């Protein structure tokens, strides 16, 4: 009857790749990776 | 029985008055036009 759902731009596919960068930012720099560069630190020491 | 009917009141089915075989029904196509236009500025070529 003239009715069309649209299809999303992103796929679920692209939408998980953002969500493992975003995991992978924080198990591996902290939170100097929304602020600026990616700065390395130990995992046990982010957590002190 | 002669018609058919899916939930929503709508034929999706019907059987020859004159052979009486089970003959689905499924409306013709249709759907949108979009155009995409790199700018009239820069180009007159078009996709759809």
Same mark, same amino acid.
């Given at each position: 009857?003239?009715?069309?759902?649209? !299809?999303?731009?992103?796929?679920?596919?692209?939408? $998980? =790749?953002? @969500?493992?960068?975003?995991? $992978?930012? /924080?198990? /591996?720099?902290?939170? @100097?990776?929304?602020?600026? !560069?990616?700065? =390395?630190? !130990?995992?046990?020491? =982010?957590?002190? | 029985?002669?018609? #058919? &009917?899916?939930?929503?009141?709508?034929?999706?089915?019907? &059987?020859?008055?004159?052979?009486?075989?089970?003959?689905?029904?499924?409306?013709?196509?249709?759907? #949108?036009?979009?155009v995409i236009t790199? #700018?009239?500025?820069?180009?007159?070529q078009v996709a759809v």
């Amino acid at each position: 009857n003239g009715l069309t759902v649209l !299809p999303p731009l992103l796929t679920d596919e692209m939408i $998980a =790749q953002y @969500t493992s960068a975003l995991l $992978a930012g /924080t198990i /591996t720099s902290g939170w @100097t990776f929304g602020a600026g !560069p990616a700065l =390395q630190i !130990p995992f046990p020491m =982010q957590m002190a | 029985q002669q018609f #058919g &009917r899916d939930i929503v009141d709508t034929t999706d089915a019907v &059987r020859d008055p004159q052979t009486l075989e089970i003959l689905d029904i499924t409306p013709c196509s249709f759907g #949108g036009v979009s155009v995409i236009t790199p #700018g009239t500025n820069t180009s007159n070529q078009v996709a759809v």
